């Protein structure tokens, strides 16, 4: 099946041919606007692996992200305080740029509902992404029981709570000795549980 | 391109610096080793085609 061929091809990203195609895309998108709807998927494989289904009610939004770190938002240097917290320029934001992209699209298209994302290309200044969105009221989705879990009102704005593939990684959850701080629901609830006194009746 | 260049080193018989070069880019010894043996075998295929 061709898709398996497609897969190892897109893994051959260093090859001269793939390099050429991505190079042309990156030029093309740089000249287009920073956020717009693609009519069909750029990567059919990535979409099928992730969940995309050639049916009504699926949309794909291309978005351009500016690259680099996070300098502290402050007037001059003048971070008033101690020389420990003087640090400011070479600081790095905890979440990726990929989740940032997802966040911006989801907030713009509020009615829609964010499934997942994949990479397409990059310059120095910019990365590029393809965000898969869904309409939760078209009957194609409502009646199909595999998908009607998204229609439920809990999953509003998933990207904002970090339940997307990117959001799960920032939470630091995992099994084993490498992921002890999250035991419990999250990093926050761990701290709560360890730093509470249980004053009993009987003591 | 790096694989091509490491091949040209295997042609000029500098197997240690070629290994060094791969280890420098890719990192570990095992991955570099298995990649090197593959590149030697394809050069063997060139030896076969020149033979027959």
């Amino acid at each position: 099946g061709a898709y398996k061929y497609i897969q190892e091809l897109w893994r051959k990203k260093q090859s001269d041919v793939m390099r050429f195609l991505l190079r042309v895309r990156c030029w093309q998108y740089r000249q287009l606007s920073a956020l717009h709807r693609a009519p069909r998927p750029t990567r059919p494989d990535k979409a099928r692996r992730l969940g995309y289904k050639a049916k009504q009610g699926y949309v794909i939004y291309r978005i351009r992200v500016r690259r680099g770190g996070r300098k502290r938002p402050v007037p001059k240097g003048a971070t008033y305080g101690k020389p420990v917290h003087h640090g400011v320029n070479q600081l790095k934001f905890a979440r990726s740029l990929q989740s940032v992209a997802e966040e911006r699209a989801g907030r713009h298209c509020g009615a829609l509902r964010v499934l997942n994302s994949y990479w397409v290309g990059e310059d120095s200044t910019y990365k590029f992404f393809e965000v898969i969105l869904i309409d939760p009221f078209h009957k194609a989705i409502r009646r199909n029981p595999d998908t009607q879990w998204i229609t439920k009102p809990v999953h509003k704005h998933r990207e904002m709570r970090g339940l997307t593939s990117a959001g799960r990684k920032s939470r630091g959850l995992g099994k084993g000795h490498k992921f002890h701080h999250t035991i419990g629901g999250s990093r926050r609830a761990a701290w709560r549980r360890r730093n509470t006194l249980q004053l009993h009746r009987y003591r | 391109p790096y694989e091509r260049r490491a091949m040209e080193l295997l042609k000029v018989s500098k197997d240690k610096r070629a290994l060094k070069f791969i280890k420098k880019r890719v990192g570990t010894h095992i991955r570099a080793k298995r990649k090197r043996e593959e590149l030697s075998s394809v050069l063997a295929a060139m030896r076969k085609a020149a033979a027959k």
């Binding site: 099946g1 061709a2 497609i6 091809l9 041919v17 050429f20 | -």
Partner: protein, 90 residues
């Protein structure tokens, strides 16, 4: 730009006169329209009351599987698909 040969190859295209003959052939072995489908199944219902011929085969995944199966003698392709990665290897 300096275009690599594996893409340049699509510029070599089939001539007008031979292509018309190809379409002349497929016109004989066209797949059935929807309305004829209801009427053939209706006649088949009559068959129920009382072998498919060869046809074209569509879809890349179909084509390639039955290429591995070495059944197809002739493979036609379109030159102007928007992401080329689909067909390149074929």
């Amino acid at each position: 730009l300096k275009v690599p040969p594996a893409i340049n190859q699509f510029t070599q295209v089939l001539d007008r006169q031979t292509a018309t003959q190809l379409l002349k052939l497929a016109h004989k072995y066209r797949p059935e329209t929807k309305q004829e489908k209801k009427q053939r199944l209706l006649a088949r219902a009559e068959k129920k009351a009382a072998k498919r011929p060869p046809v074209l085969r569509a879809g890349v995944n179909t084509v390639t599987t039955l290429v591995e199966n070495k059944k197809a003698q002739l493979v036609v392709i379109a030159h102007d698909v928007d992401p080329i990665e689909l067909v390149v290897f074929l």
